[PDB]
Paper text:
RdRp of IAV is highly conserved among influenza viruses. It is composed of three subunits–the polymerase acidic protein (PA) with endonuclease activity, the polymerase basic protein 1 (PB1) with polymerase activity and the polymerase basic protein 2 (PB2) containing five-prime cap binding site (CBS). Host five-prime cap binds to the PB2 cap-binding site, then PA cleaves 10–13 nucleotides from the host five-prime cap and PB1 synthesizes viral RNA. One potent inhibitor of the cap-snatching process, pimodivir (VX-787, JNJ-63623872), is a cyclohexyl carboxylic acid analogue inhibitor of host five-prime cap binding to the PB2 subunit. We have crystallized proteins of PB2 wild-type (PB2-WT) and selected mutated forms PB2-H357N, PB2-F404Y and PB2-M431I in complex with pimodivir and obtained four high resolution structures.
The binding of pimodivir into the CBS is mediated via four hydrogen bonds with residues N429, R355, K376 and E361. In addition, residues H357, F404 and F323 create π–π stacking with the inhibitor and the azaindole part interacts with residue Q406. The dissociation constant (Kd) of pimodivir binding to wild-type PB2 cap-binding domain was 2.2 nM, which corresponds to a Gibbs energy of binding of −11.8 kcal.mol−1. Pimodivir bound to domain with a large favorable enthalpic contribution of −11.1 kcal.mol−1 and slightly favorable entropic contribution of -0.8 kcal.mol−1. Stoichiometries of the complexes were close to 1 (one pimodivir inhibitor to one PB2 cap-binding domain). There were ten water molecules bridging pimodivir to the PB2. All of the active site water molecules had favorable binding “free” energy in the pimodivir:PB2-WT complex at the PM6-D3H4X/COSMO2 level of theory. Most favorable were water molecules 1 to 6, especially molecules W1 and W2 had highly negative binding “free” energy. The largest difference was found for W5 of VX-787/PB2-WT (difference of 1.66 Å).
Numbering used by the authors: 322 to 483
Write the structure that this text describes.
């Protein structure tokens, strides 16, 4: 078990190895991240949302989420998008150079990224991508404005209807 973003993560299948990599954020800062390489599935358990996250190397494959309300679901989706380590999430960082502003505090870069997007996820959601969805009974899309859609969704994301 490990906690991230206030969700308890448990790997339910697969495996990964860690490759240290320097990535360039949207505001041109460098982070040294432990990139997980391989196919994995995780459960995410929160107080107000639960999800199943299937991913590969720097790629969200599927996120199925259920939650108390749109804000709780969005909270789970932000964490999953950061945890994915996707390039479009890295490139969505904007604003003050506040990863650079911290030198000898030697903070965890994945925690820095999540804390950044917890301030304002609009650019993260607008740059993630949307796709057309199959009509799966009990499941619905969620758009970048966090409204439901039966026809389109944020890429790889589906909501299991309360
Ligand atoms: O510093 C780390 O590497 C920590 C922080 C940032 C993400 C996880 C939770 C906090 C990470 N811890 C763990 N990650 C992982 C892990 C497996 N696949 C992953 N893919 C992406 C990722 F991002 C983390 C992981 N497994 C065990 C862990 F214990
Ligand atoms: Br890291
Ligand atoms: Br469209």
């Amino acid at each position: 078990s490990f906690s991230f973003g206030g969700f308890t993560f448990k790997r339910t299948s697969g495996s990964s190895v860690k490759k240290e990599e320097e990535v360039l954020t949207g505001n041109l800062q460098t982070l040294k991240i432990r990139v997980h390489e391989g196919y994995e599935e995780f459960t995410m358990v929160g107080r107000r949302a639960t999800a199943i996250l299937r991913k590969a190397t720097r790629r969200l494959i599927q996120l199925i989420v259920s939650g108390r309300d749109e804000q709780s679901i969005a909270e789970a989706i932000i964490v999953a998008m950061v945890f994915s380590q996707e390039d479009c999430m890295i490139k969505a960082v904007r604003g003050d150079l506040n990863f650079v502003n911290r030198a000898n505090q030697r903070l965890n870069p994945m925690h820095q990224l999540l804390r950044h997007f917890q301030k304002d996820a609009k650019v993260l959601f607008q740059n993630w991508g949307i796709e057309s969805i199959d009509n799966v009974m009990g499941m619905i899309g969620i758009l970048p404005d966090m409204t439901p859609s039966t026809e389109m969704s944020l890429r790889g994301i589906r909501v299991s209807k309360m």
